[PDB]
Every structure is written in structure tokens, then in C-alpha cells.
């Protein structure tokens, strides 16, 4: 770490004044002051990226423990294999610990922006105002993005990630406010990243031009255009957000109400009781009712909010596709909006924990990973007097870590504030079709094209075969995203069963899916198994195998 | 002051330099080698310009401030903006605006020179300065599939030689990607501030950035949707979007058009107006004017439920705020080169029919020259710039005549059917507004662009109590053969009748406005009149 010892992570100091902040959600940190909390954020986010890259604390550094350039942080060793000769990082996917370490990573990523807040204090405020900043600073906590709740009809990637430039107080100059690039927009170096000095250049597990990107992109990247365009492809936020809204194709038709399935599958996640740790906490899969999990959901947004698709066979005016870095585990960390999307992930697994208290790495899979050394991150163990690695059960409470959210103050109220923010739409277009539900379950490996990113998309009737992409691709019902021993997921069915049956006299509808990679083309030899259940009754208020699942073909043209 | 637009000056190793296509010109700068000094000074010259403060009456807000709002004094000249627009003298008044832009990002290429180039390196810098002319968009050409906005104004940053610091290259903001200032427009000091579209609340130029229903701090920088942009531009009939069908991007076909089709008089090519033949309707400032749409999006909002959104509003759709956009001066280059083509093919095609002849010796204010018969500063007239070659500068395309008609067919072209299209710019009191027509039934809910059902093509009223001048309209056309190939094929051979809406800028529409819409075939006759398209009722103004 800095000053050659290891950066103890504890999370923001505990001071008697400042008794367990909260993590906000950031449309509502920011509407209630569009201002010392906006300026620190903005103001120490802008130093901590534009830090050198020998700076263990700059923004690349820290962003570079989660993947690429895959090297070491804080004397830990990087250049890790897996037994395949691929590269990896630090962090967890597909396995029990993914919410923990991700837990330990946003912990760490508030306390350098805290510390770095003190620091702009020290140097730019005067006399008169720096107790006043110092409070601000101490009650700051990481905002959470909530891609689950509808912002202020549809969810929405959040209002400061959509903005290019942001005013700040100067302090000494009351009323003065500047614009500035926001920090939270993009995260720009100063050069291609593929370019940077040894040993941090991004180079090639990825197929997407990430080395020649400077800057990080929301669908930027697309083949046939100038390489000098990906460069910095830019944030194309409106294209986030309609990814986002996904939910069934026949919902786009009149006469039919949507229901987000992001936010269907949410509330799904925090509701669904009876399971256990292993089951929720991972994509994981080594019953089916069960398959919701966190991981898959928080894969899903990784998708929508970067996109992976390159390119599209064929002759297209309306460009649909586009990649960017939140799609890519080596690189997702780059762009700023994954620490808010992970502080929302720390969030649904607190609110888990509160409804779910005893279900804490109690099942035999998981339980072998619970004792497991969260590398890289140090913290200093008091029993023993050394520095050690965290383990998952020192952050089972995340209050240890002097944080807290609004919604896991009062667990007597949670299951309202569940239902308030989460359920009213499912419940309102559930509330108009019979007493039953249906669900897909999805189960695949996540090597199967070598490591490659891959999304599985379901239809219920017959697939276009030039279209088999998104929500308004004919017949479409949900799709399941692998953000690269098998992984499951599972996708609500319910309304499109019941459209689909309107269709088709009653008959159930055969789940047939097309496994698409990131040129667009359907992939034959990607093995996914696919299946329809049911129960009587709704979610919210015992499931059977109705339907078996079917590979649909595509044109010739559109084949892998 | 007064500033006396010459061209950039003669320089006898630099003859008659050329006005290169922008994306050849980036990918010679970019590609045959590291030494990007055109790149550089152009890129650093209109850092400069659009620095400077705004008592500066060639920075760069200033000089897009000549063409509309905030409509202050320039040059001496007091301050509707001084851009003309519908009338003959629209390509000539645009010609000298180009040339003022070229002349003082030039000047600013020499003072980049001077300030940041060590003496031995001076000549080569300034030898590039000398030969760089300000390039031009070929909106009408196939980009190095389809037609698209330039690589260069695409890219949020650009990297730049730094003089004197050999090998080393320095990423920077890219001055052609966006115009920024520091604060909204809105709050600029008297008399300048910029205060519908909320444009008030931009502090940055955007392209689709503006929609209603997103807070208003995202307004202030919309961003650049080149994608939306170039989907815009290639705008071709909804049919062409079935499977088995070629598509052909109209704004192609238009061009190639108006290049070729002879026996036009200056009045005919050179505006919109029409003062009180469909087939001679086609001219150079309706094609100028549905780009200008296609690159900014002139909708804030659309009625109903859309999860895909695709409207979306910013400056080039707008009269008085386009010149901000730095796309708008490229945009105006090829609008001066594509007059440099039809006069090359059409000699002797000069103000001189009885209606536009009354227009040629206006003066168009407020560009200032030197008269050297009475050596006195006069305004520039149109008869100055009738040989561009004047100004020092020319196009590749009319450096050879002889070959100049196969080169159009290269560019643009590799019975007849068409719309003719009669308006006035004033039948929404001067408000903008897009003629959209159908073949066939329109969806009541969907009504907009090529993804509406049966649309053939738009027409934009690029403008923007108050009326037209009086006894004058406005002309446009549009091709219409594929269209109605395709419309008797699904209808029984049945002649369609042209549907027409006109949409606002809420995506309504305006029931009460009347267009004269109607089809001609080939001698054209006059084979269906057009008539005004229903919509939903929640989507009627
Ligand atoms: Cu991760
Ligand atoms: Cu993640
Ligand atoms: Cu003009
Ligand atoms: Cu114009």
C-alpha cells in the first residue's frame, strides 16, 4: 500500500457524532441538492482518477483488482491463471463468496473516496467552513444505484450517470459554483488503454477493442466504424435504459400492460423465501423454484448498462447493438457507474440477510467457501495482532463496517418498503390473470464458448430468424446474460405464458432458445437446458415441469 | 472592425488549395503517417476561437451568433438574424459566412504558430497552415453502406502533435465534437445570453440530446447521438426495411438529382422560395434543410407509450441556435460545394430569371470588403463570389470539368414518380414543423420516419402572429418511383394517394395545417393530390 505497508480496510472511521450513516440512493442524494456532499463526491472522485498509475489508490488501480491488466494491488501477487491458461483477477464470480468480496470491494472504494474527501479539505477550505465540510464529509456515504425502482414508469440508469457536467461549490467563493466533467460520467486516461505503460496496458479474455478505448462506454463500440471512434465510443444512456426495461415483446402490443422484468425478478429475489445461502448468494450450480439468485440478476445489469453486442449480420438502418465495458469482467470496473450498481448489490444482499437471518453460508456447498481469504483486501486482526485477509463472516454484519441502509434500519417494516418500491406493478398486471405462476428455469456453463460472453434468449412461438435479439424481436420473453461446475438462472413467465396461451387455444408454450455471442450470431454448440414451470397460486401470495426446452434455428446468414 | 473577408490570402506554393471531403482529409491526417500538423492546427486554431470571450467578435460564439440568436451587432453592423434563408441569395450569403469561418480559424493557425512553434520548425508548420483549406461533409456519400456524419465529429477527443516535443502526442477535447461554454446559454451576460426547445438551459451544443421527462441538469450537456443522427440521415421509405427489399438512402437520390437534372434557373436551385414546374422543385436549400433536421432532432416529446425513444431535440434542427453546432459549418461547406457543382454544369445559370434576378445585388450584410474601383468598404454582393476561386479555395470535383458528370454518378448515383411539396414556412406562426408522407394507411400512433408504416419521405420547415412575407411560399420534392412500385404491388396497381401529417415539435399533429401534396409521373403529369392523414386522438395538437 501507500508508504509501503498494507492499506488496512475498515470503512470509514467511527465518530461519536456520525452514528451509522446511511448509503443513499443517488437520484435522491442528488435531486435534494441540485451541495458540500455533491462537491466532495465529484471533487475527490476527479483526484482519486486522475492519480498516477503507480498510486496504489488511483481510480485505475482500484478498478484493476477486479480484472484486466490482472496485476498485483497491495503486495498481493496478480497474473493469476485459471487451469485453462486464461486470465483472471481478484474478484469472485459463480461462486458463494461473490456477494462478500464485492461487499469488502465497495467498502474499500468509499473509504479512498472519504479519505480523499479529508484531503481536499485539508487543501481547499478555509477556517471558517472546514468543520462544516469535515461533517459533510464524515455523514457521506457510497449512494447506491437502484436499477430496480422506478425513477422520478420505467427504471432508469441514474441522473448523475447521464450527465457529462456537474457544478460544485468553491469553497472560499460563496455562490461561486463551477461545471466540471463529472467524474461518475465516464472515467477517462490519457491515453488507449491498450497503450499504457507496462505492466498495466489492457490486452488480450476478451474479443471487444477495449485496447483501444481511453475511455470507458455505454454501447460505443460496434464494427465498421473508424477505430479512432472507439476510443471513446460515449455514454449512450437512452440505449442503457431501454436494455433495462426488458420485459416481454407482447407488452409492446395494445391492449397489454408491462411489467419491467428486472424489477419482477427483484422482487422475486427479496420475497422468495426458504432459501439458502448457497442458492442465493451465486449463479453457482454444482429446486428450480430456487434459481433466482442474485448473481444472475446483477449479471443481467451488467449487460443491459453496457451492452456486448459488436456487431449484427446483415443490413441494418436501426443500430440496436453496440458493446461496452460493463458487459466485460476484466474491464467492468472501469466505468464508474459499477461501484454504484455493486452498492446496490451489498444493498439487496443486506435486505436478504435481514428477511432471511438464519441463511448465512448454512448449506454444504457453500459452507467450504465461507472460511475463504478475501484477497486482496487487508484488514488487521485484533485477536491475533497480525494483518490477514477479510473472511465473509467479518462482514456478515456490513455495520461493522460503519454503513447502513435506510431500508435495513427497522426490519419490522421491510417487508412493506419491499412491496413498496418493488412489487406494486408485478402485483398490479399480476392481479388481472388467474391465480398462478409460471417461471423459466435456465441452466448452462459458463466456459461453454471458451470463456467467451454469451446471452440466452427465450421465445414462446415461432423465432424470427433475423431478429432474435431483445424485447422487440417477435415473440421474445427474457434473456439471461453470461457475465464470464455450471451457472443457473431463472426468468418470471407468468404473463407470457398467459399471452402466448391466448395465442395458441390454451396449449402450453415450448420455451425455444437462441444463444447469441457478441457478433450477433446464433452459437449451435452451446449447451443450455431450458424449462417451463408452474404452480397454482401467485408468487407473492409447489412447482411442476410443463415445458421442456427446444434450440430455435435462425437464418443461415445469422449462424455462428 | 471593420474585418475584411478576403479568403485566405495567395500564396504562390499553395495554388487554389482545396476543400478536402473531412473524412479522407482525417484519415490522411491520421493514417499515412504520425505527422498530423493539419489535425493539429485545426483542432488547436478552434480551441482557441471558442475560448475567446464574447466582446471578441471572432470567437467562435460570436461568429455562430451572425447567423440567429442572440441576434447582437456584429462588425459594426446592428443586429431575426442576419442568415438568409428562403430566398436566392441563401447559398451565396452562406458561401462568404464559410469563408469568414475558414479566414479566421486560419489567422488563428498562424497565431497557434507563432506562440507554440520554435523557430526551425515555423516554415514546415506554416506551409501546412497555408494548404489546409476548411474541409467539407459529403452528407450524400457513401462513408469509407450507408451515409453518416463525419468519423471526426463522432470522436469526444483527438490527439494532437505538441510542436517541439518530437514523437510526443497529447489526447484532447475535440472542438468539432461539440461547442462547450461555462455556464448555460441562458445566463450569458447581456446582450448575449440565449433566452419551444430549451435550449436556455444548454450549456453545450447536443445532437437528439434534449427530451421532455428527463431532469433539466440533464439538458445542459444532451450529448451527441451521432448513431440517432446517421439513422436520420439515411432515412429511405418504410418498405425498404421488408426482407427482399434494396434500400436506397433518399438523401442520396436527392442529391444526385439536383446535381443532374438540367434546365434549371438560379431562381429553381437555389431556395425554397417560391413566389406566385413541380418537376424543377427540387433545390439545394430543401435538401440542406431535412439534413439539418436529420442531424439535430427537432421532437422534445411524443405522445403515448414508447419504451423506445426515439425522438430527441438539439441545435442543428433550429434556425436560431444551429450555427453553434460545429457540424453546421461542414454541413455549409458542402452546401457551398454542391453550388460550385450545379454552376460548373450550369454556366450560365446566374440570377438572371426574372424572380431572382431583383435579389442579386443584395448586399449581404454584415460581411465587409474592400472596393478597389473606389477604394471603400462595401458590403460583399453575390456577384463577388459567383467564382469561389476568388476566395482563394476550391474542390476537387470542379477542378476538372471534363469529368465532373462522371464523378457526380461515381458519388451519388451508382416511368418517374415524384412528390411535389407547396408550404408556407409560417403555417405554425413561424414555429418548426416536419411534413411527413405516407403510401398507403398511416398508424395513428406512429406517424414519424422510416419505422412508421408506409412512410415515403419528409419534408422540414427549417425555421423558427407572425406571417411569411406576403405573395411567397416554399417548394420541396421528393423521388417517389420505388415507393409507388412497391404501393401498386401490395394494392392492386392502384395510383396512391400521398397522405400527409404535419408534426410538432411535441409529436403531434396539426390538424389545421394544409400542405399542397402531390404526386407526378412521367413530361411530368399530375397523376394524385394529396390529402391530410388522421391520427389518435391523444396524439392530435
Ligand atoms: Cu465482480
Ligand atoms: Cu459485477
Ligand atoms: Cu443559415
Ligand atoms: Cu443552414
Redesign the interface.
Given at each position: 500500500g501507500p508508504g509501503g505497508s498494507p492499506y488496512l480496510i475498515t470503512g470509514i472511521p467511527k465518530d461519536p457524532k456520525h452514528p451509522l450513516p446511511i448509503r443513499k440512493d443517488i437520484d435522491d442524494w442528488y435531486?435534494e441538492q441540485?451541495r458540500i456532499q455533491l462537491t466532495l463526491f465529484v471533487e475527490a472522485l476527479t483526484v482519486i482518477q486522475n492519480r498516477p498509475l503507480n498510486d496504489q489508490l488511483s481510480y485505475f488501480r482500484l478498478a484493476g483488482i477486479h480484472g484486466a491488466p490482472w496485476t498485483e494491488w497491495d503486495g498481493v501477487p496478480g497474473g493469476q491463471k485459471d487451469s485453462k491458461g486464461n486470465p483472471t483477477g481478484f474478484c469472485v464470480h459463480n461462486n458463494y463468496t461473490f456477494p462478500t468480496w464485492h461487499r469488502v470491494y465497495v467498502t474499500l472504494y468509499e473509504q479512498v473516496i472519504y479519505e480523499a474527501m479529508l484531503d481536499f479539505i485539508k487543501q481547499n477550505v478555509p477556517q471558517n467552513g472546514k468543520a462544516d465540510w469535515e461533517n459533510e464529509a464524515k455523514q457521506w456515504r457510497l449512494p447506491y444505484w437502484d436499477f430496480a425502482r422506478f425513477a422520478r414508469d420505467?427504471l432508469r440508469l441514474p441522473?448523475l450517470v447521464?450527465?457529462?457536467?456537474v457544478k460544485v461549490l468553491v469553497p472560499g467563493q460563496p455562490g461561486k459554483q463551477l461545471?466540471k466533467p463529472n467524474p461518475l460520467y465516464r472515467f477517462?486516461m490519457?491515453?488507449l488503454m491498450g497503450t499504457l505503460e507496462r505492466p498495466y496496458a489492457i490486452t488480450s479474455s476478451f474479443d471487444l477493442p477495449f485496447d483501444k478505448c481511453?475511455?470507458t462506454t455505454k454501447y460505443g463500440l460496434?464494427e465498421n466504424?473508424?477505430a479512432?471512434?472507439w476510443?471513446?465510443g460515449?455514454?449512450?444512456?437512452?440505449r442503457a435504459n431501454?436494455a433495462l426495461?426488458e420485459?416481454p415483446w407482447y407488452q409492446?402490443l395494445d391492449g397489454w400492460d408491462?411489467v419491467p422484468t428486472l424489477q419482477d425478478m427483484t422482487f422475486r429475489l427479496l420475497t422468495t423465501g426458504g432459501l439458502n445461502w448457497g442458492e442465493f448468494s451465486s449463479t453457482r450450480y454444482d429446486a428450480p423454484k430456487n434459481w433466482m439468485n442474485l448473481e444472475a440478476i446483477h449479471n443481467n445489469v451488467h449487460n443491459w448498462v453496457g451492452g456486448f453486442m459488436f456487431s449484427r449480420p446483415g443490413?441494418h438502418?436501426?443500430?440496436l447493438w453496440?458493446a461496452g465495458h460493463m458487459s466485460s469482467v476484466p474491464v467492468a470496473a472501469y466505468d464508474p457507474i459499477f461501484w454504484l450498481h455493486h452498492c446496490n448489490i451489498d444493498r439487496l444482499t443486506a435486505i436478504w440477510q435481514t428477511v432471511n437471518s438464519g441463511s448465512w453460508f448454512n448449506d454444504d456447498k457453500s459452507k467450504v467457501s465461507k472460511d475463504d481469504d478475501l484477497r486482496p483486501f487487508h484488514r488487521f486482526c485484533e485477536k491475533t495482532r497480525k494483518v490477514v485477509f477479510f473472511r465473509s463472516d467479518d462482514v456478515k454484519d456490513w455495520r461493522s463496517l460503519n454503513y447502513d441502509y435506510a431500508i435495513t434500519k427497522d426490519a419490522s417494516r421491510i417487508r412493506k418498503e419491499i412491496s413498496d418500491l418493488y412489487g406494486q406493478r408485478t402485483k398490479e398486471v399480476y392481479k388481472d390473470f388467474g391465480e398462478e405462476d409460471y417461471i423459466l428455469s435456465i441452466r448452462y456453463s459458463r466456459y461453454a464458448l471458451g470463456g467467451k460472453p454469451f446471452q440466452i434468449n427465450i421465445f414462446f412461438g415461432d423465432v424470427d430468424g433475423?431478429d432474435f435479439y431483445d424485447?422487440?424481436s417477435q415473440n421474445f420473453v427474457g434473456s439471461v446474460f453470461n457475465y464470464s461446475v455450471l451457472s443457473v438462472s431463472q426468468l418470471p413467465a407468468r404473463l407470457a405464458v398467459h399471452y402466448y396461451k391466448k395465442q395458441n387455444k390454451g396449449e402450453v408454450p415450448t420455451p425455444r432458445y437462441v444463444v447469441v455471442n457478441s457478433q450477433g450470431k446464433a452459437e449451435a454448440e452451446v449447451k443450455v437446458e431450458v424449462a417451463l414451470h408452474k404452480t397454482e397460486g401467485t408468487f407473492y401470495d409447489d412447482y411442476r415441469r410443463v415445458a421442456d426446452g427446444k434450440r430455435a434455428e435462425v437464418d443461415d446468414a445469422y449462424r455462428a
Open positions: 435531486l441540485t420505467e441522473i447521464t450527465m457529462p457536467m461545471s477517462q490519457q491515453t481511453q475511455s460496434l466504424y473508424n479512432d471512434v476510443a471513446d460515449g455514454q449512450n444512456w437512452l431501454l426495461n420485459h409492446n408491462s443490413r438502418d436501426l443500430k453496440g433475423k424485447a422487440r
